[PDB]
Amino acid sequence: GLPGMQNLKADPEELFTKLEKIGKGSFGEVFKGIDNRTQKVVAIKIIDLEEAEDEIEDIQQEITVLSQCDSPYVTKYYGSYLKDTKLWIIMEYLGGGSALDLLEPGPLDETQIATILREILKGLDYLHSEKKIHRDIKAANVLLSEHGEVKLADFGVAGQLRNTFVGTPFWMAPEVIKQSAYDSKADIWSLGITAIELARGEPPHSELHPMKVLFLIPKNNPPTLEGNYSKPLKEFVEACLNKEPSFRPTAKELLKHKFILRNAKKTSYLTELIDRYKRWKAEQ
Numbered sequence: 001g002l003p004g005m006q007n008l009k010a011d012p013e014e015l016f017t018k019l020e021k022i023g024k025g026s027f028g029e030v031f032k033g034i035d036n037r038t039q040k041v042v043a044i045k046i047i048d049l050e051e052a053e054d055e056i057e058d059i060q061q062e063i064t065v066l067s068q069c070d071s072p073y074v075t076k077y078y079g080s081y082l083k084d085t086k087l088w089i090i091m092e093y094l095g096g097g098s099a100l101d102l103l104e105p106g107p108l109d110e111t112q113i114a115t116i117l118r119e120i121l122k123g124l125d126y127l128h129s130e131k132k133i134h135r136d137i138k139a140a141n142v143l144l145s146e147h148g149e150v151k152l153a154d155f156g157v158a159g160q161l162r163n164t165f166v167g168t169p170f171w172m173a174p175e176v177i178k179q180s181a182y183d184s185k186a187d188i189w190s191l192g193i194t195a196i197e198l199a200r201g202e203p204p205h206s207e208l209h210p211m212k213v214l215f216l217i218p219k220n221n222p223p224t225l226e227g228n229y230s231k232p233l234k235e236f237v238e239a240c241l242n243k244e245p246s247f248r249p250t251a252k253e254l255l256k257h258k259f260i261l262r263n264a265k266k267t268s269y270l271t272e273l274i275d276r277y278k279r280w281k282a283e284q
Contacts (some may be wrong), residue, residue: 002060003067004079012081012088018044023098026156027052027059032093042078043091050085063089065132065158070187073123075143075153079111094151096144096274103139103201105280110233111199112273114263116142117236119150120191121260124251127152128184133159137190138171139197148270168205169210174218174243185245188254192240196225199233 006012010136016033023030035042047059066077102108108116120142127134134141135157143144145155155168163179173189175182197203204223205213222241225234236259243246248277254260 041093045089047087071126094143095146099142100139118264123152148267188248
């Protein structure tokens with residue numbers, strides 16, 4: 001059945017202290033929680049199975065893919081518990097917030113953008129080397145630890161090596177929307193959209209109805225990064241955002257792109273970004 005499923009007599013309400021809401025996945029609410037035995041903080045996604053239907057197979061695939069990953073760049077999975085009709089999925093807690101949150105106080109600079117993209121690329125290199133496709137790369141799914149470590153989250157639509165129509169519209173590759181045969185290169189296109197999001201704060205077409213977005217992506221020339229950004233950053237975006245998937249580089253190649261090499265710095269410096277968000281949120 002479900003990888004990591006714990007003893008059905010384990011009462012997750014006994015094993016964990018459930019605290020405030022912090023986010024949402026493909027299928028449920030997420031709460032910060034405390035493991036009552038170790039006192040480590042965890043993220044707990046709770047899904048109501050009585051409420052699910054013709055999705056359960058999806059939840060099952062999310063958890064299986066997650067359970068198969070073991071990387072410093074992918075959120076860890078600690079197991080699942082069933083309580084009455086609710087499934088408790090225990091995940092790694094990343095206290096820094098998502099990259100999208102970190103944009104709330106103001107723009108990022110190019111060292112911050114390059115550092116975050118570099119770590120996303122380490123996670124995609126890992127997933128692609130394992131024949132997995134993330135399928136939902138976007139700033140909201142790039143999470144930071146309180147130390148500035150950057151990890152990929154939310155595998156609700158993750159694939160395993162496709163032509164299934166999945167993803168969040170604004171970040172979907174043209175071939176994913178047209179339901180053509182696709183692979184890891186679709187994540188490279190989403191990375192290019194995420195690079196635009198990290199530079200500008202929103203993805204292309206963000207103010208349009210998602211249904212318009214469905215015909216504009218396959219029809220229009222690909223987006224480019226507009227504004228006063230460096231030529232290496234604009235070229236990194238263009239490399240990723242080619243309509244021909246075979247013309248997009250691999251993640252391993254992008255780790256050596258001049259934008260990354262000339263601008264990325266250690267991840268520990270991202271704690272400045274996390275502090276900025278904390279100070280900002282503290283006022284508000």
